[PDB]
């Protein structure tokens, strides 16, 4: 079941025998990272790296010793030697703990992994903080959203996503710390 032992190690020796000699081998995205899952370490006690990403910015890359992830089965917290997991997140609040401090970011979905070396790397789409979100427009949008139930199952899925996102955003902004 491993008939093609692929990797960045093998591609050069298969590529050099077909491309002309003036061409160097094309690089790989793994050569722009140093932290993997197989490379152990990255704990050294309690503080472990959280890599909280989004497509247009990086809101965190430092080490925080506790991060809770609003997973689709429920809000769950991540510790240093946490279970290696791939977790799908429902739209909720991500909070980053490194001590007494908590930065509260409401994310709009996206997966969040825990790798077996002990780095978590949250992968969300739109990471708006809970300061710049108003409690006015969300009820004005869900009140129109909670009425229209059309015959489009595609719009049924869109309405269901809108309903869960607006309800979780209201419940996450009204109960702030």
């Amino acid at each position: 079941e491993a008939a093609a032992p692929a990797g960045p190690k093998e591609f050069t020796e298969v590529w050099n025998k077909k491309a002309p000699s003036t061409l160097i081998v094309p690089e790989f995205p793994s050569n722009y990272t140093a932290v993997k899952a197989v490379g152990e370490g990255q704990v050294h006690g309690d503080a472990f790296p959280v890599n909280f990403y989004t497509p247009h910015s990086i809101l965190s890359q430092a080490q925080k010793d506790t991060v809770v992830l609003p997973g689709v089965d429920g809000y769950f917290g991540v510790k240093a030697s946490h279970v290696p997991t791939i977790a799908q997140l429902k739209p909720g609040v991500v909070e980053l703990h490194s001590g007494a401090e908590s930065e509260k970011f409401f994310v709009s979905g996206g997966f969040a992994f825990v790798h077996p070396n002990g780095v978590t790397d949250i992968c969300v789409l739109e990471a708006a903080t809970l300061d710049q979100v108003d409690p006015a427009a969300v009820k004005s949008a869900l009140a129109a959203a909670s009425a229209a139930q059309p015959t489009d199952e595609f719009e049924q899925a869109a309405n269901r996503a809108a309903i869960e996102l607006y309800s979780a955003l209201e419940s996450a902004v009204e109960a702030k710390a």
């Binding site: 309690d46 917290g77 991540v78 510790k79 030697s81 946490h82």
Partner: protein, 74 residues
């Protein structure tokens, strides 16, 4: 001699309330294994939570024990 016979027959049926208590300790400690398996960095506080549940539900087992001790000799 039924006066002290029925104490023994009643006590044998009285001490069977330890069964559900032992089942409760077993499911609580199996959940303790799963809890220390999800995130082991709290597994001192989680085992403290297990003892916190354990003493409060062994309280009801010693309540059954004083019931079965109470009808046996008093």
């Amino acid at each position: 001699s039924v006066l002290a016979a029925s104490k023994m027959v009643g006590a044998g049926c009285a001490t069977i309330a330890l069964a559900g208590v032992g089942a409760g300790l077993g499911v609580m400690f199996g959940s303790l294994i799963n809890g220390a398996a999800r995130n082991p960095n709290i597994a001192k506080q989680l085992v403290g939570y297990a003892l916190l549940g354990f003493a409060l539900t062994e309280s009801i087992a010693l309540f059954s024990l004083l019931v079965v001790f109470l009808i046996l000799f008093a």
